[PDB]
Swiss-Prot record:
Family from the record: Belongs to the globin family.
Name of the protein in question: Myoglobin
Chain residues that bind heme b: H94
Gene name linked to the record: MB
Catalytic activity: Fe(III)-heme b-[protein] + nitric oxide + H2O = Fe(II)-heme b-[protein] + nitrite + 2 H(+); H2O2 + AH2 = A + 2 H2O
Organism annotation: Physeter macrocephalus
Residues covered by the Globin domain: 2-148
UniProt KW Transcription regulation keyword: no
SUPFAM superfamilies in the cross-refs: Globin-like
Keyword Transport (UniProt): yes
């Protein structure tokens, strides 16, 4: 699968708005993930004990983890599909150390889409959401292939 340049521009135009406040977007996305799919919180040994949305919002550790994830994803998106180098360390850590199944990458992709739809209706209409879905599907397809090369079914 290959995105067109027009599709990449829709992706990068909404990402530019995320970048006004990466920390706040990361909080919203992780909280949505943990509320919609509580099993995913168990993978974060550093804050898996958090019990409520209020505790999640107050956690500086959770905020920093959200910034780190969205910054890595932004760098991938800006490569417009030419992301082989960026996926290597990420696939290795997520397959081998953190043990994150592809299904959980689907869950975080849904959380990203949900939050962008809520926060950015001016830059996240139907065509823009479809382009972002196609970019996240490409990311997950390529990471899944790397997982398999690395010895993890995912
Ligand atoms: C867009 C998808 C994601 C991106 C770009 C991403 C990126 C990152 C980065 C850059 C790190 C730090 C370096 C590393 O260890 O590789 C990290 C750490 C981590 N990631 Fe992800 N991640 C993603 C999705 C997920 C998901 C869905 C989970 C769990 C359900 C997860 C679990 C973890 C854990 C447990 C750590 C260690 C966190 C800590 O230091 O406390 N990641 N991730
Ligand atoms: O590059 C591997 C890995 O490191 C992270 C932080 O966990 O990003 C760091 O390295 C990038 C490439 O050199 C820099 O652009 C970035 O500023 C730096 O923090 C992850 O994003 C990435 O997967």
């Amino acid at each position: 699968m290959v995105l067109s340049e027009g599709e990449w521009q829709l992706v990068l135009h909404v990402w530019a708005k995320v970048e006004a406040d990466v920390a706040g977007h990361g909080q919203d996305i992780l909280i949505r993930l943990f509320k919609s799919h509580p099993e995913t919180l168990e993978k974060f040994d550093r804050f898996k004990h958090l019990k409520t949305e209020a505790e999640m919002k107050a956690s500086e550790d959770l905020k920093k983890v959200g910034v780190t994830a969205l910054t890595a994803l932004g760098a991938i998106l800006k490569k417009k599909g030419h992301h082989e180098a960026e996926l290597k360390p990420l696939a290795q850590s997520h397959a081998t150390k953190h043990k994150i199944p592809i299904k959980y990458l689907e869950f975080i992709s849904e959380a990203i889409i949900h939050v962008l739809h809520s926060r950015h209706p001016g830059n996240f209409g139907a065509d823009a959401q479809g382009a972002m879905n196609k970019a996240l599907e490409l990311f997950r397809k390529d990471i899944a292939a790397k997982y398999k090369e690395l010895g993890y079914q995912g």
